[PDB]
Design a protein around this ligand. Structure first.
Ligand SMILES: *[C@H](C)[C@H]1/C(=C/c2[nH]c(/C=C3N=C(/C=C4\NC(=O)C(CC)=C4C)C(C)=C\3CCC(=O)O)c(CCC(=O)O)c2C)NC(=O)[C@@H]1C
Ligand SMILES: *[C@H](C)[C@H]1/C(=C/c2[nH]c(/C=C3N=C(/C=C4\NC(=O)C(CC)=C4C)C(C)=C\3CCC(=O)O)c(CCC(=O)O)c2C)NC(=O)[C@@H]1C
Ligand SMILES: *[C@H](C)[C@H]1/C(=C/c2[nH]c(/C=C3N=C(/C=C4\NC(=O)C(CC)=C4C)C(C)=C\3CCC(=O)O)c(CCC(=O)O)c2C)NC(=O)[C@@H]1C
Ligand SMILES: *[C@H](C)[C@H]1/C(=C/c2[nH]c(/C=C3N=C(/C=C4\NC(=O)C(CC)=C4C)C(C)=C\3CCC(=O)O)c(CCC(=O)O)c2C)NC(=O)[C@@H]1C
Ligand SMILES: *[C@H](C)[C@H]1/C(=C/c2[nH]c(/C=C3N=C(/C=C4\NC(=O)C(CC)=C4C)C(C)=C\3CCC(=O)O)c(CCC(=O)O)c2C)NC(=O)[C@@H]1C
Ligand SMILES: *[C@H](C)[C@H]1/C(=C/c2[nH]c(/C=C3N=C(/C=C4\NC(=O)C(CC)=C4C)C(C)=C\3CCC(=O)O)c(CCC(=O)O)c2C)NC(=O)[C@@H]1C
Ligand SMILES: *[C@H](C)[C@H]1/C(=C/c2[nH]c(/C=C3N=C(/C=C4\NC(=O)C(CC)=C4C)C(C)=C\3CCC(=O)O)c(CCC(=O)O)c2C)NC(=O)[C@@H]1C
Ligand SMILES: *[C@H](C)[C@H]1/C(=C/c2[nH]c(/C=C3N=C(/C=C4\NC(=O)C(CC)=C4C)C(C)=C\3CCC(=O)O)c(CCC(=O)O)c2C)NC(=O)[C@@H]1C
Ligand SMILES: *[C@H](C)[C@H]1/C(=C/c2[nH]c(/C=C3N=C(/C=C4\NC(=O)C(CC)=C4C)C(C)=C\3CCC(=O)O)c(CCC(=O)O)c2C)NC(=O)[C@@H]1C
Ligand SMILES: *[C@H](C)[C@H]1/C(=C/c2[nH]c(/C=C3N=C(/C=C4\NC(=O)C(CC)=C4C)C(C)=C\3CCC(=O)O)c(CCC(=O)O)c2C)NC(=O)[C@@H]1C
Lengths: 41, 161, 10, 210, 67, 160, 161, 161, 160, 160, 161, 160, 4
């Protein structure tokens, strides 16, 4: 059987939560102007 | 400790001998190997953390060793373990650069088997983790340099058992 | 992208 | 004929590799030469300052601190050393009087073993004689750990040996009798290698009063 | 805790050192109150000149609350 | 425990426990049943505490369960929830012992080395402890919740 | 050192499980005796010098131990024996408060026989002084507390022979 | 450390007795020998370097120990060997003056075997050298003082063997 | 002893005994009979030295031999005279040795710890030795008394 | 050897060799062949280097080989050449190593004590090495001699 | 530190001259006072604790200095004051024995004035206590030795201003 | 002198001088008259002591006063005689103080470094002091010469 | 106080 601390014991819990991964983001260093976009507080 | 050069020099001095042909050959052989040793050494240091991470992942994760009752359980023990693996990789790289295992006998293996038996560190698991380090390093340095590291990491493994 | 597993490697 | 001066430097009989290995490593360990002494001669080089600090941790605690700390408690002490407000000696004593040192090398062991680990870390040697064991046993019995560390690091021997600017290091004393082999036994053991006293006490030659 | 800030010039007596030694010759340091008497005695015995002593931390005359 | 913490402190000074140290040991033993109740509450509600904390965590840190994230995928999420249960089991050790010694020596000493080697973002582990603290503090009275919170917060402070 | 609470917490952590009913009862038992231990430690600390003084007066004085040739003879060795008894009472008090003799094993008994054997300290006389520490202590902390203190003063005596 | 006088005192002290007539006889015997011991000590100190030089010449030089690979080979080891011989002669002179060997058991022999055996110092060769020191100093200070110094140099040698 | 003292001083400097030290040793051995006579004198009159000095002490410090005093009662009074006998014998050891180390190693290291543990007023012990110094001095010529006085004063100066 | 020194330095700081250190070791091994040739030159002409140096030495220090001198006679003279042979051999060790460490560790630590004990005039030993340096310089190119002289000069400085 | 002899030597050496008649006279005078200095030193060491006891009782006790608000109030500060006086007397005795105050400049008046001003120790009361030490000593060692001890105790007093 | 050495030893233990140390001081001051006699003898014969010593040295060491020698020429040889006078003056200081300390502090600490810098053969300086010892020992009795020998020898020993 |  599964012993204490075995991550298998939380697989059921993990599936129940079914966390939502962020969508593959739409980012591109090519389109970014570094010197203009960096905050200037 | 001694490197490849001083081993030849010291063995000549013990015999009261000038460096003869056989000694000169050994010195030439180490000098020729020198370039590949510094390259492998520079590679390993850039990847030291990632090598140990991969070796642990493939040998000492999700087993009874890291679970309660296993010798890696608790964060302080986990840290001590990967600290130990870091020792072996760094000293094995010293020995690789020196072309001589004596630094391992002196600064690594002296009292290590006794210390592990005192603390209950599982040597079998440790040698497995070292073997995994050997596989991971060979993939990064190459085949020739990988074998050289393999010699010295195996030397540590055999000194543990 | 890799998916890491929680099983021990064999 | 072979020149006489050549014969006078010759090794009798052939020597096999075992004899060669034994003869090559005889005498005092090459570790006496093959070492580095961290002497902080300036505070302008922060890399050197940090190197001296990390050597200090390794000397006093016998290894790097990361795997047995949560967060570092020595940050202000490093700040003072780096700012030249204290010296290496004060930094070294700051390590010996720290809660971390108490946990590592006082709580796990009896005061008798605390003494020899103390002199090892801070003086570089095993205790000299029974007078020294007595002297530090009274300090531990009456004032505790911090007083003991303060006694060693502020003594004349420490200043003559390591001074104010140098991290302590392993020593290879010739005198007095048994100091070399006792220091050797202390420094040839790994940390936590066992729970045994190297120098429980010096067997007296003449019992005064008995 | 109370602390002294002390300046001292400690010469070299029985050797001609070749490394840099200014850092251990003329220095200013913080000494815990409970170590100053002993430390001052040691510097004096090593031939050192105590050139400046100040109570960097704490107040003179405190009876309770020395930390 | 509070007892070993005091003893070690007095032993380092070659002295008997002070009146204050004995005072807090006396108080600790007197309020023992309240600590065992708080510890009893957390143990019984551990499954809901971790799940609801696990759910709250990933909604604040969706990246860690996104591609490239440390807890990406169900199997790594299960490992992450396991780690939350570890640190929940340790908070109950802290409360019954009256001291954070069981927490430090089991789960915090060297933890930064462990999570650095694994690549787990440590500040996100701390966040999961906040979430368990909130789910926990709603399952008991404020006085009981307040005592339990102090030990949750200790972990959050040390991990952060 | 581990106290009674730590042993329960460690007995469960090694299995990786929360505190169950049986563990709670062991904690409850210790919590019950908390006043008994704290009260005894208060009086002992108040009378530490007196307990040793009267333990010595009743056990070692006016015997061959203190007369010329006896191991307590000479002022230096008299003080050393007094210092040792101060140790044994202070550490027995620690053990009593913690309900556990681990601190005696670690901070007292480890290597003690080696030390005494090298210095010629008589074990049997040392055991009598400790047993006299016990009887004097019992008469001052009451009978119940003196029973618990007797367990840990007996533990030192057992570890010395 | 104990000299001839404190040997008398200690024997009286362990019995708690003042010095009686027999004890005063022993002190007188040592006082009568004082002039012989002092004169011998000054001659030895003024000739210490030369005593060792001749002892080395007739006992160690031109042998396996000085040839390459030998324990006395290398300037450091040769210098250490002379230094050790200086120590033995200087402590024998202390012992001869004190009229008591206890200083040798305490400040010379304590841990000496362990030191030499760990370093590979040849015990027989050092014993032969000390015996050469005994012969040389006897021809300098006379038979009576030579035999007195012989006791304490022979004491060292018997300690090492 | 004078010989041991100079040897340890010379060993501490890793040197042979200096001519000054060797001359001091030569004088001591050559004046040996004179010292032993002083020790013989002290030894033979030890009964009267201790009794008279003890009688004077209790006159000088009647409190120590009153209710609540450390030496109250004949039995405690006997132990006080025993202690005085101990210290007289040590003075004779110092006389014949030409050095105080036999006195120091036997009866002055840790003396404060011993007498505070027993409750004895140590300064009264200094007084008792002081009293023995007068009685002894009055039993010998001034030059002999001066030689013994140095060792009496050393004991007195250490306990006091 | 720079390799041993670098590892000693690196391990004393518990770190991998820095890129600068590895570059020095790389240059060291590349220049090995030139170092080995110089060693072969000195090793090949060993017997003539010593013999001619000894003859030059005795020409300008005749006392040491005349009656009463340390090296007087055939046997003692051969021992003097044997010592010179020792130091020439150490010079080859240093040449190959690229460092004076083999020279110092084997034949210079405490050399003054050794020759003082033997009654050998140390300044004449320094002269003999000077004589061997001049002879050896005339057996190799100017660049090769300049490289070899650093090792001869190291011995000479340590004998002065 | 320099005694009276080394002071005379240094005076001649700084001028690079041999010891002339006047310098020999100073050496003779110091030699002739030697027995008196050693006598006084023996007296002070026997009564040193008593000397400080009575000097304090005469100059400091039952005054504002020892009452609340006084610098010598609190056992902590009382003991610190007693220590200082104890060191003053002993160092004044060294200076008297040596016949030269250099030891006082180096091992007493080296940072002491600035330490006292930092902590608020009253110099005026310190000087009076020292003066009381001078009065008490003169009653013990006589007038010729007491005047000499007063010279060096006065040196300390004026050193503190 | 032995006075400072005793005090320094006593101050290391924060103690008063023991009776033995005081007795040694008393013996030292008594022998002061003999010390002064010897020093007066050397001082009165200093010009002849140095002149004869120089002649003796130069016959033994013609190289130093030959072309290329450190002491070559009238100006350099006079300076060499001055150094001999310096060390004679230091030996006088050692005599009156009964200790070599003034010699060590004025003329033997760093002496090798200074003469090596000047190109002075230190062994020839050591020889000169031997010559002065020989001449000086002939102007005083056996005991006085034996007394003064320790200081002459000390200079020689530190110059090896 | 009795020592018997
Ligand atoms: C969840 C809030 C976060 C997270 C967790 C996470 N952890 C791992 C892997 C491990 N975690 C541990 C932790 C412990 N072991 C102990 O003994 C203790 C105290 C008792 C602790 C806290 C260990 C040892 C592992 C290694 C795996 C094993 O059990 O053998 C992972 C997976 C790492 C991987 O890539 O395999 C994860 C995901 N990750 C997040 O992103 C959250 C912030
Ligand atoms: C990891 C693969 C395995 C493991 C490791 C582990 N080691 C320790 C403790 C120590 N390890 C050492 C080893 C060395 N110290 C050195 O200086 C060197 C030479 C360079 C070596 C090889 C030592 C000395 C210790 C104790 C001291 C210290 O930790 O600093 C532990 C901790 C044991 C404990 O009880 O705390 C662990 C866990 N454990 C496993 O299960 C793996 C197979
Ligand atoms: C941050 C808001 C601003 C800033 C900070 C800054 N500080 C330093 C250097 C030091 N700071 C300290 C201060 C302390 N050390 C201590 O131990 C404590 C007491 C607990 C304090 C308050 C010290 C001593 C130093 C010098 C030594 C050291 O580096 O630790 C620096 C670095 C300066 C340098 O070049 O070395 C900086 C950057 N700088 C800003 O611009 C902020 C406004
Ligand atoms: C020579 C031209 C002049 C001279 C020199 C002299 N110096 C000292 C003492 C010291 N010199 C220094 C200097 C330095 N130490 C360092 O580490 C560095 C930085 C790289 C320097 C510049 C120091 C610190 C001292 C004291 C400590 C020591 O010597 O180690 C002395 C001796 C002083 C004394 O009385 O002890 C002398 C004689 N003196 C002259 O007259 C020349 C003009
Ligand atoms: C008293 C009941 C008996 C006795 C005692 C005695 N002990 C010593 C010397 C030492 N005792 C210790 C003990 C400890 N050190 C520790 O760390 C611990 C753990 C708390 C203990 C118990 C040590 C280390 C010493 C040596 C150092 C020292 O003396 O301080 C002596 C002196 C022996 C000697 O001749 O030096 C004595 C007399 N002797 C008896 O006769 C009693 C029965
Ligand atoms: C020749 C230039 C000078 C000289 C030489 C000389 N040496 C000896 C005797 C010995 N020399 C050594 C030297 C060494 N041993 C080592 O280990 C090292 C480094 C490898 C060295 C240089 C030793 C050990 C001896 C002792 C004899 C032995 O080898 O067993 C002598 C003979 C002295 C005697 O009296 O026996 C001589 C002549 N002498 C000169 O005058 C030259 C200046
Ligand atoms: C000479 C006859 C033989 C010989 C000697 C030799 N000794 C060593 C090293 C050491 N010798 C000692 C000895 C002592 N230390 C003490 O405190 C005392 C008590 C008075 C003694 C006798 C020690 C401790 C050492 C090691 C530490 C050190 O050397 O400083 C060596 C080796 C030196 C080395 O550096 O390797 C040698 C050569 N060797 C022979 O072959 C002779 C028979
Ligand atoms: C008399 C001047 C003072 C005095 C004396 C007193 N002493 C005791 C008890 C003891 N005294 C000693 C002393 C020594 N033991 C040694 O080995 C040495 C040798 C140098 C000494 C000086 C000891 C050991 C004891 C304990 C008893 C025993 O001998 O076994 C007492 C009795 C105290 C009690 O309550 O039993 C007394 C009275 N008391 C005074 O008031 C005088 C000032
Ligand atoms: C009474 C129970 C005992 C006793 C007392 C006693 N004390 C003195 C003299 C002094 N006591 C002190 C104490 C303190 N001053 C402080 O600042 C502190 C902390 C607040 C303490 C405890 C001082 C300073 C003195 C000196 C006098 C002064 O005030 O300046 C005496 C008088 C002694 C004498 O000879 O003058 C006495 C009698 N005596 C006993 O026998 C009781 C056991
Ligand atoms: C007593 C007559 C007066 C007095 C004294 C007093 N001093 C201090 C604190 C210190 N005194 C010293 C003195 C010395 N250091 C030296 O090196 C020397 C030469 C041997 C001397 C005399 C030092 C260094 C200190 C500070 C460190 C320490 O005390 O350990 C105090 C304590 C002040 C405080 O705030 O604690 C006192 C009371 N005070 C009086 O009122 C008397 C007139």
């Amino acid at each position: 059987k599964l012993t204490a601390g075995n991550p298998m014991n939380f697989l059921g819990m993990a599936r129940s939560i079914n966390p939502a991964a962020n969508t593959i983001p739409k980012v591109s260093a090519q389109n970014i102007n570094i010197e203009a976009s960096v905050p200037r507080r | 400790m001694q490197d490849a050069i001083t081993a030849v020099i010291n063995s000549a001095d013990v015999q009261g001998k000038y460096l003869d042909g056989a000694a000169m050959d050994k010195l030439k052989s180490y000098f020729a190997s020198g370039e590949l040793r510094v390259r492998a050494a520079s590679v390993i240091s850039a990847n030291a953390a990632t090598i140990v991470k991969e070796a642990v992942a493939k040998s000492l994760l999700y087993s009874d060793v890291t679970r309660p009752g296993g010798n890696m359980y608790t964060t302080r023990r986990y840290a001590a373990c990967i600290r130990d693996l870091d020792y072996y990789l760094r000293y094995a790289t010293y020995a690789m650069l020196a072309g001589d295992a004596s630094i391992l006998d002196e600064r690594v293996l002296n009292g290590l088997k006794e210390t592990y038996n005192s603390l209950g560190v599982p040597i079998s698991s440790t040698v497995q983790a070292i073997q995994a380090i050997k596989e991971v390093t060979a993939s990064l340095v190459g085949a020739d340099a990988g074998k050289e590291m393999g010699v010295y990491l195996d030397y540590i493994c055999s000194g543990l058992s | 992208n890799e998916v890491r597993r929680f099983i021990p490697q064999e | 004929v072979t020149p006489r001066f050549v014969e006078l430097g010759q090794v009798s009989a052939i020597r096999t590799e075992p004899e060669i290995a034994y003869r090559s490593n005889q005498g005092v360990t090459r570790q006496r030469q093959q070492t580095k002494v961290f002497k902080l001669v300036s505070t302008y080089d922060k890399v050197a300052v940090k190197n001296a600090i990390r050597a200090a941790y390794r000397q006093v605690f016998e290894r790097d601190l990361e795997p047995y700390i949560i967060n570092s408690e020595f940050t202000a002490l490093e700040s003072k050393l780096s700012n030249n407000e204290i010296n290496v000696k004060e930094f070294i004593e700051g390590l010996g009087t720290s809660e971390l040192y108490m946990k590592e090398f006082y709580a796990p062991y009896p005061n008798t073993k605390v003494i020899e680990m103390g002199t090892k870390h801070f003086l570089g040697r095993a205790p000299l004689n029974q007078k020294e064991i007595q002297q530090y046993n009274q300090i531990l019995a009456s004032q505790g750990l911090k007083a003991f560390i303060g006694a060693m690091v502020n003594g004349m021997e420490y200043l003559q040996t390591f001074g104010e600017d140098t991290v302590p290091y392993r020593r290879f004393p010739t005198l007095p009798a048994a100091n070399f082999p006792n220091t050797e036994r202390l420094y040839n053991k790994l940390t936590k290698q066992d729970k045994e006293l190297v120098v429980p006490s010096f067997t007296p030659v003449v019992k005064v009063g008995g | 805790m109370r602390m002294f800030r002390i300046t001292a010039c400690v010469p070299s007596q029985t050797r001609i050192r070749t490394q840099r030694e200014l850092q251990n010759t003329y220095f200013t340091k913080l000494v815990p109150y409970d170590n100053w008497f002993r430390e001052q005695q040691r510097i004096m015995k090593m031939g050192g000149k105590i050139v400046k002593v100040e109570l960097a931390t704490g107040r003179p005359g405190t009876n309770a609350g020395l930390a | 425990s509070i007892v070993t913490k005091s003893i070690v402190n007095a032993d380092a000074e070659a002295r008997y426990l002070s009146p204050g140290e004995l005072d807090r040991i006396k108080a600790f033993v007197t309020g023992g049943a309240a600590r065992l109740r708080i510890a009893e509450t957390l143990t019984g509600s551990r499954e809901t505490i971790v799940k609801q904390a696990g759910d709250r965590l990933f909604q604040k840190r969706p990246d860690i369960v996104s591609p490239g994230g440390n807890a990406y995928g169900e199997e790594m999420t299960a490992t992450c929830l396991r780690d939350m249960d570890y640190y929940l089991r340790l908070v109950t050790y802290g409360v019954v012992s009256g001291d954070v010694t069981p927490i430090e020596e089991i789960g915090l000493v060297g933890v930064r080395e462990m999570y650095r080697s694994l690549g787990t973002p440590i500040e996100a582990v701390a966040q999961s402890v906040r979430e368990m603290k909130e789910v926990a503090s709603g399952l008991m009275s404020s006085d009981d919740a307040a005592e339990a919170s102090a030990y949750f917060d200790f972990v959050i402070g040390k991990m952060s």
